[PDB]
Amino acid sequence: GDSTECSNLLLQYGSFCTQLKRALTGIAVEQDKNTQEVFAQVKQIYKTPPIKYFGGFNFSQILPDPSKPSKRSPIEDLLFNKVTLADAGFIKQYGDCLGDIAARDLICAQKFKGLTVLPPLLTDEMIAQYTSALLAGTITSGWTFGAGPALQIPFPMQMAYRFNGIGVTQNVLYENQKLIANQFNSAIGKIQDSLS
Amino acid sequence: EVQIDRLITGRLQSLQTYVTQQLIRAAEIRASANLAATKMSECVLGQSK
Amino acid sequence: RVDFCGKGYHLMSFPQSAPHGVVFLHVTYVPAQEKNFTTAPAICHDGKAHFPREGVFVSNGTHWFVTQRNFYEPQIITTDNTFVSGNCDVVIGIVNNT
Amino acid sequence: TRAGCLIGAEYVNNSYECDIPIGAGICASYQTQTKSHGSASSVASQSIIAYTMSLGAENSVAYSNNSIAIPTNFTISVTTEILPVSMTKTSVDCTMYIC
Ligand SMILES: *[C@@H]1O[C@H](CO)[C@@H](O)[C@H](O)[C@H]1NC(C)=O
Ligand SMILES: *[C@@H]1O[C@H](CO)[C@@H](O)[C@H](O)[C@H]1NC(C)=O
Ligand SMILES: *[C@@H]1O[C@H](CO)[C@@H](O)[C@H](O)[C@H]1NC(C)=O
Ligand SMILES: *[C@@H]1O[C@H](CO)[C@@H](O)[C@H](O)[C@H]1NC(C)=O
């Protein structure tokens, strides 16, 4: 606590605090490494094209929403609301830094006990930006953006490639392109319904 | 001083156990995150056979 | 496996011992110097749809070729590198060619 | 910044790659700028600047429903992956250490 009397006895036990703090700092930098390795697999941010016709496929629930303040996708919005949010280390001049959304405000209490939660190096806004860049590369470039320069390709062509990659002749994909698009849209809708 | 020493030992053991369980579940999270990076590379950045 | 033996298309790897560890010299292939072309999903000829066997259809503006998906090398589209399967109505975006 | 208060570093609207992660996308760096027109290796003020992280060059992939990109050349890259294998095996004489 706020006591030097205990601290004098505390330092007698050695560099145990040094080890504990080093372990926690390693854990935190490892979390940063985890986020960077999962999301920051590219160093170019790709802009989603304005016209979003992709051969009948519908990515509205996964592409970013321009009207949303945070530009999160509807599916990402569902995932954001459903999960019981913790704190993210934000600050809104509230005294308690960030405003937790009526779920786990007790983090403020956890702040008082000589402890805090550190914000991620990538904010959820720029994490979503990385995710949007990955999605735009996948939709536009395919797999090529991960092995060097991004090489644009129409989405039905990438679907033909993915068909060929599982031992199914890609011509089938073009003979039932509309069926595949409809099944994908329905499956995304059912994903939303199941998650909600 | 004796009672504070006892409480320090108890809280230090609690913190040490917390840090070790965080290390274990952080190794678990790191395995899951290496799996997630592998899935990003082979499922999102490519097609995995 | 993508990005398992280094970024890019992994060609080979060489081990090198180091104090308490190993260093892999991941010899990988990386593409560069890209050119943009006009592409089609299939070629409509004689009322039937031809799909490339192994590559992809590109056009520099006036002529249509089929190239390998990872290295630019135009080749004249023939029956040896394409297969006919279907009819010229279902393919959304088919392109007349020879 | 959302992580807290930064003193001694000047905020810069330009964005570079992260060097010293401060937090919430904000990074610090020791930069050599000629704004003060003073010495080359030492500016009149503190050279510690803070900036929003540049996630990368904002490339715009030229998507079109009939456009493709094909690479004409290549580079044979030799990167280096370092894997720890075996830590130094250690023996502790329990009796000699403790007693
Ligand atoms: C291709 O061009 C735009 C770009 O996406 C698209 O909206 C349109 O429907 C397509 N037009 C044709 C003729 O294929
Ligand atoms: C395209 O090809 C078909 C047969 O391959 C032919 O009937 C048609 O006239 C051609 N042109 C157009 C614009 O469809
Ligand atoms: C396309 O390639 C062919 C290959 O011989 C060439 O004859 C033609 O001039 C090229 N067209 C353009 C616009 O470069
Ligand atoms: C490909 O790039 C290499 C660079 O290592 C260059 O020497 C070579 O001339 C290039 N090839 C062509 C056909 O431009």
Cα separation, D50 vs A141, in Å, equals 34
SS3 B26: helix
Tell me the count of B-C CB pairs closer than 8 A: 13
Q: Which of D74, D79, D86 sits opposite C71 (nearest CB)?
A: D74
Subunit partners of chain D (3 or more CB pairs within 8 A): A, C
First to last CA, chain A: 43
In the three-class reduction of DSSP (H, G, I as helix; E, B as strand; rest coil), residue A34 is classed as helix
Strand stretches in chain A, DSSP E: none
Report the C-alpha gap between D24 and A38 in whole angstroms.
18
From A51's Cα to the closest Cα of chain D, the distance in A is: 9
> What does the H/E/C string look like for D10-48?
EEECCCCCCCEEEECCEEEEECCCCCCCCCCCCCCCCCE
By the CB < 8 Å criterion, does C8 face chain A?
Answer: yes
Nearest in space to D74 (alpha carbons), one of A159, A37, C50, C27: C27
Distance between CA atoms of A50 and C23, rounded to whole angstroms?
45
A127 vs A120: CA distance, rounded Å: 10
Chains with 3+ CB–CB pairs under 8 A to B are: A, C
Token pair for D32: 């050599």
Instruction: State the burial class of residue C57 (Cβ atoms within 10 Å of its Cβ: 0-12, 13-18, 19+).
Output: buried
Cα Rg of chain C (Å, integer): 20
Q: Give me the phi and psi of A22, to 5 degrees please.
A: -65, -40
| CA-proximal residue: ligand 3, atom 6 (nearest) | C63
Q: Which structure tokens are listed for C78? A: 């023939």
The residue with tokens 């409509």 is C44
Nearest to D23 by CA among A113, A119, A173: A119
How many Cα atoms are found within 13 Å in the side-chain-facing hemisphere of D17? Answer: 6
Of the candidates D80, A141, A33, A130, the one whose C-alpha atom is nearest the C-alpha of residue C6 is D80
Ligand 1 atom closest to Cα of residue A52: 5
Please, are residues A48 and B47 in contact by the beta-carbon 8 Å criterion? no
| CA separation for the pair C75, C61 (Å, rounded) | 15
In angstroms, rounded to a whole number, what is the distance separating the alpha carbons of residues A35 and A123?
Answer: 11
Count of Cβ atoms closer than 10 Å to residue A45 Cβ: 20
H or E stretch at C22: strand C21-24
Ligand 3 mean position to D8 CA, how many Å? Answer: 60
Overall resolution, Å: 3.2
Q: Which token pair is A52?
A: 């979003």
Q: How far apart are CA D18 and CA A149, in angstroms?
A: 22
Q: Measure the CA–CA gap between C41 and A56, rounded to whole angstroms.
A: 15
- Do A158 and A142 contact (CB within 8 A), yes or no? yes
Please answer yes or no on whether B48 and C3 come within 8 Å at the CB atom.
no
Tell which residue, A35, A52, A68, has the closest CA to residue A136: A52
CA–CA dist B21, A116 (Å, integer): 18
Select from D74, A165, D77, D67 the least CA-distant residue to C70: D74
Bridge partners for C65 per DSSP = C58, C76
Q: Is the CB of C53 under 6 A from ligand 3?
A: no
CB proximity list for A66: less than 8 A, separation 6 or greater: none
Among the partner residues D70, D85, D88, nearest to C72 by beta-carbon distance: D70
Looking at residue A175, its amino acid is E
Distance between CA atoms of A153 and D69, rounded to whole angstroms?
A: 7
- Count of CB atoms within 10 A of residue B19's CB? 17
Cα nearest neighbour of A115 on chain B: B15
Give one word for B36, left, alpha or beta, with left for phi > 0 and alpha for psi -120 to 50: alpha
Distance C60 CA to ligand 3 centre (A): 6
Answer whether A136's CB lies under 8 Å from D61's CB. yes
The Cα–Cα gap between C86 and A173 comes to 11
Contacts 24+ apart (CB under 8 A), B40-45: B40/A38, B40/A39, B40/A41, B40/A134, B41/A41, B41/A146, B41/C1, B41/C2, B41/C3, B41/C4, B42/C1, B42/C2, B42/C3, B44/A134, B44/A138, B45/A41, B45/A138, B45/A143, B45/A145, B45/A146, B45/A147, B45/C2, B45/C3
How many whole angstroms from C93 Cα to the centroid of ligand 1?
10
- Say if CB D26 and CB D16 are below 8 A apart: no
SS (H, E, C) C54-67: CCEEEECCCCEEEE
Query: What's the rounded Cα separation, in Å, for the pair D95 and A123?
Result: 51
Contact partners, residue A100, CB within 8 Å, separation at least 6: A85, A86, A87, A107, A108
Distance CA B36, CA A141 (A): 21
**Contact between residue D10 and residue D48 where contact means Cβ atoms under 8 Å apart:** yes
The three-state secondary structure class of A79 is: helix
Order of strands, sheet of C48-52, starting from the edge strand that comes earlier in the sequence? C82-84, C48-52, C43-45, C95-96
Q: Give me the residue from A32, A46, A121 closest to D59, CB to CB.
A: A46
Across the interface, of B19, B44, B49, the residue whose CB is closest to A138 is: B44
* Residue C53 to residue C84: CA distance in whole angstroms: 10
> Is the distance from CB of A75 to CB of A191 less than 8 angstroms?
yes
Residue B9's Cβ-count burial label (10 Å; 0-12, 13-18, 19+) is exposed
CA C42 / ligand 2 centre spacing (Å)? 13
Ligand index nearest the alpha carbon of residue C65: 3
Which chain C residues are closer than 8 Å to D80 by Cβ?
A: 23-26
Give the tokens for residue B37.
């990076």
